[PDB]
Amino acid sequence: VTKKASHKDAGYQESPNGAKRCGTCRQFRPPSSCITVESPISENGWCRLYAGKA
Numbered sequence: 858v859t860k861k862a863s864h865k866d867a868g869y870q871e872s873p874n875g876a877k878r879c880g881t882c883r884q885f886r887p888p889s890s891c892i893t894v895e896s897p898i899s900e901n902g903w904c905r906l907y908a909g910k911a
């Protein structure tokens with residue numbers, strides 16, 4: 858079964874970046890998954906590969 862990108866390979870941190878977090882993001886998948894990144898991921902652990910969407 859195919860794997861996501863690691864939170865590491867996605868450029869993540871342990872806190873939000875200003876306006877941007879996980880939580881809902883443009884890409885978050887509650888309670889602990891992501892559409893960019895592997896699970897378990899933090900509900901505030903923002904990644905650099907998150908979607909450029911408005």
Ligand code: SF4
Nearest residue numbers: 879882884891893904
């Ligand atoms: S794409 Fe990145 S910032 Fe967005 S929810 Fe997933 S890990 Fe977080």
